[PDB]
Structure formats: C-alpha cells, structure tokens
Symmetry: C3
C-alpha cells in the first residue's frame, strides 16, 4: 500500500524530539533517522563488524559501540573511504526506513530527518513540517542540554543548513521557542490536517 | 543558437508521452531523456566499450547491444558500481542532449525528463511543466498498461519523487487523470505562452 | 559571533564582481568562492596533500604549490577523476568558507558563489541575491571579454543553470544589463535592508 509521509526537520536545539513526541502521543508512527542510524551500527551489528574489518580495531570502543570520532578522522579528505562507508550504511538505512514505513499502522507516518534540507530528502516526503526557533534559542537550549559553550554551538549552527533554507522547503511551520506545551494548539491542527490529507491522497484528482 | 527549453516531467503512469506527443502535434521537437540514454549505449558507442571493460565482455549481447537486465542485476547490490555507471553516462547524455537541442528547428524544444526532480535537472530548464495525476491513476494505468501488480508500481512510486515534490518545482501543471483528448486544450494554451516566452527570452531585460 | 550570510550569484557575463565591489565600497567583507577554492589547495592544506597522495607527487610544483597544469591533464586523461576532485574539495571548501565568515568583521558578509544554483549552495546562505541580465548581455559581454564566438558562448550558457533557475531561488534580484554605476541605488537599498536583518536574525522569534 502507499503510505503518506510527513517529514519533520529542524536545526540543533529546535526541539525536534519534543514535537515528534507530541505526534507519537496521538498514535502516529514516528520514523527516526538518527535512531535508525544508531541501530544500524549498534554492538554486534553486522555493519559494525564490516566497519571494524575495513578500518581497524580502533573503530570499536571498550563498551562495544562505534567510535564515531575515530571513523570520522579516517574518512577525512578521503572521498574513496567516505564512498566506501556510505555504500555500506546508506542501503541498510534506506531499507530499515522503508521497512518501518511499510510496517506502520498509523494513517500517516512522521519521518524525522535532521538532514532533510542537506540531503534533499524533502523530495521523498509528501509534506514537510519544520520546527522553527531563533538561532538564540538553538544556542541556549544546546548550551544547556549538552553542557557546551556558545562558540561550540555556533560552530555547529554554521555547519547545518540555515533557518531560511529550512523555511524555503516547508509546507508547515511550528514555532518552538517556548515551553513544550505551547506547541499543542499547532500540533492538534496539523494532526487533523494530516489525517485528512492521508485519507484522500491516493485518489485526490486535483492537488492542494 | 540558444533554444528555449521547456522541461516536461511526471511520475510513472502519469502519461508523459501523451502530453509530449500533443506538443509534437503543434510542431514542437521533443527530446526524450530515455531515448538519449539508449542512444549513448548503442553498439559502437564509447560508453559501451567502457562498460564492457569495467564490467566484462558478458555485458555485451550477441548482436553487440547492452545486456541491460544483467547490468542492472550486477549493480543492484553495489552502490559504488551504480555510481560508477552514472558518472560515465552523465557527460555523454548531456553532450547528446545538447546536440539534439541544437538540431531542433521548432521555436522551442520540449525536453522530457522522467528523473527531473530526482536528478535536480529543473536547474537546466527555462520552464518546467509537470503532468499531474492521482497516485490511484499512476497505479491503475501502469497496472492496466504494463500488466503488472499493484505492489509492483507501489515500489516504483516509493523509488520516485513524490507528487508534491514535483508540484513544488512546476511553473505549469497539466492534469492527465482523464482521456488523452481532454489534454488538447491545455496543451494549446501552454504552447501559445511558450511561443511568446521563446520569442522574447534572449533579449528580455527584466524577468517575467 | 554568528554572522549573517548573503549569497551573490549570476551567470557568466552578469558582472558579479561589479556588484561585489559595490558592497565592498559600503564596508562589507566579500568572501569569494573562486578565491576560497585556491586557498584550500595552498601549501599545508589537506586538499593539497590528498591531491598529491591520489595523483602522485608530480601534482606539486617546484615552489610547493599545486601544479594546476599537471592536475588539469590527469582529469582530461580520466574524466571521472573530476568527480573524485569535486568530492574532495566540497567539504573542505565549506569548512574554509565557514572559517572566513567567522573571521569577518562586517555585520553580514557577501558570499560570491558562481555555482550557487548548480551546486545548491544556497542551503548555506541566510539570503540569496541574484545579479540578473538578459542572455544577450551574457553573450555580448563574454564575446568582448574573451574574443570568442557567439556559438562558443551559447555552449557555456547551455552548460550553466538557466536564468529562470536562478530567479527561482532569489530572495532579491538586481539588474546589471547596463553601466557599472547604474546599480548604486539598488545596492544602497539592499545594504540598508541587510544591515537590519543582520542586526536582528539571531534573536528573531518569528521568521521574516
């Protein structure tokens, strides 16, 4: 069957999880790109074995998890090694993603993709929702949540797509500058709208 | 000489050929990406020599043509090999497409590109026309024509950009849910506009 | 701190450097993607070492800098090396760009990017300014500048993003079909707006 896909994105500290949890509480199957990626390389995972074999024993930590910074260093300024890693991980991630879409029982799925803009993954969504906040909010929340410096987060902000680049691809925008309950009004309206879109989309003659 | 390029795209089953042929009917040269892709791997072409060298002489049929099914089967579990193939074919298809745009003597060309959204090729078009239909139509017409199962087309649709992603990059939309004849008037309207756009685009000082 | 990024782009013959110069005259740091590309292959830089590792020590000139002519020929001998080279430079160019934007002293920077649309690099700008001219201007200016044929320029134009593609991603558009001083008034109005956006973007709750 065809499933309706609403993709959710937002920059660091925008409160992506908060909004996705609000939809999850309404019975929507959330498909989380970062959760999937972490599971693909979890201890005893086949791909983690392949990583260790190709790159070295230095790739696996004491506790058995992937040493992400060491792997990063390994592919730095090396397109062939970066290509090798992607050729291993991308199809496993794609497969698990499609699998979860297919196994979803909710009327639409919420696909949470931090890199939606950067990887052009909006092309694979029926609807795009952006959780939006000020860069100030992104800095403060990140500084506080992960106990890190302002300059540290500022560097992360400089590496992700801009706030404007996300808004350029958005169908819907939810402001998340305040407390978690402040999103409830938008979430209720968007959910009711998405359920309607999902119920009509396969046979809908005229778009929008 | 600089030709005005209108790009036509649509999902599987959207009836791209029906619309392109209606533009041909009004005297427009149609350049078809799928046809160009076939032409660049014809017996004797460089791409074919290169493919046999990289993949083996078993990629070449008795009659010297490409064993497409075998090539697809070979690159299927290997993104690296799929990427190699695309990097080879990419500049050759671009070369041939330009050659055929240059040979065209109609007032503008219609460039039919199934993968327009997926490959970001709308960047190369002066104007984008999307042929739009319901997912049900894609399914029913592709089942009815190719005589395949519901669950065969569904897989195609999961591999393609969504309906909404295509509408997101369209300048013009033509609905093709119905019969081929309901298309005639819409195409005539668009052709008149494209004649005007084409007559003025080289010297037009201000954007429309 | 975090600096506001205005991207500038335009096709060949649009007079990008004339616009960039007008903003520099108003006190804005200009960050040029073609200059960055040279800086990332300077002695001591990772891209330089990776080029030498990949192609051989012959890629390094007597003075330790990149032997551009030798690299040019290796790409020509194997066209698919272009892809390796682009893949290497993409991340490194962005990192160097981020580093220079972080170091600028003007409230916003003007980031001049010829391939902004072709490479989707607008995803890394806060705002997009397109310098726009008719194809006729592009043709005549390139003919005069390089003493090349019309037919030679038309092939370049066929190779770059279209006029309409750039207009599709533009936040602001500036006409530069005429004399270099004719842009003065439009640049001043844009400059005043950009300083306001720069002063407000970090704490701005609501988008635009």
């Amino acid at each position: 069957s065809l499933r309706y896909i609403v993709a959710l994105t937002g920059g660091i500290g925008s409160g992506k999880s908060t909004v996705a949890n609000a939809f999850a509480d309404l019975g929507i199957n959330v498909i989380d790109a970062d959760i999937i990626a972490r599971q693909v390389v979890e201890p005893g995972a086949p791909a983690l074995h392949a990583i260790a074999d190709h790159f070295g024993a230095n790739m696996i930590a004491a506790d058995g998890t992937l040493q992400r910074r060491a792997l990063r260093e390994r592919i730095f300024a090396n397109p062939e090694e970066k290509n090798w890693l992607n050729a291993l991980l991308h199809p496993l991630i794609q497969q698990e993603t499609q699998h979860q879409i297919q196994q979803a029982t909710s009327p639409y799925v919420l696909w949470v993709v931090p890199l939606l803009v950067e990887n052009s993954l909006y092309k694979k969504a029926n609807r795009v929702l952006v959780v939006d906040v000020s860069p100030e909010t992104q800095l403060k929340r990140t500084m506080q949540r992960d106990d890190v410096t302002r300059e540290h987060v500022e560097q992360i902000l400089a590496a992700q797509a801009t706030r404007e680049a996300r808004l350029a691809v958005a169908d819907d925008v939810i402001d998340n500058n305040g407390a978690p309950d402040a999103i409830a009004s938008d979430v209720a309206r968007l959910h009711a709208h998405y359920l309607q879109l999902a119920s009509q989309f396969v046979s809908q003659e005229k778009p929008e």
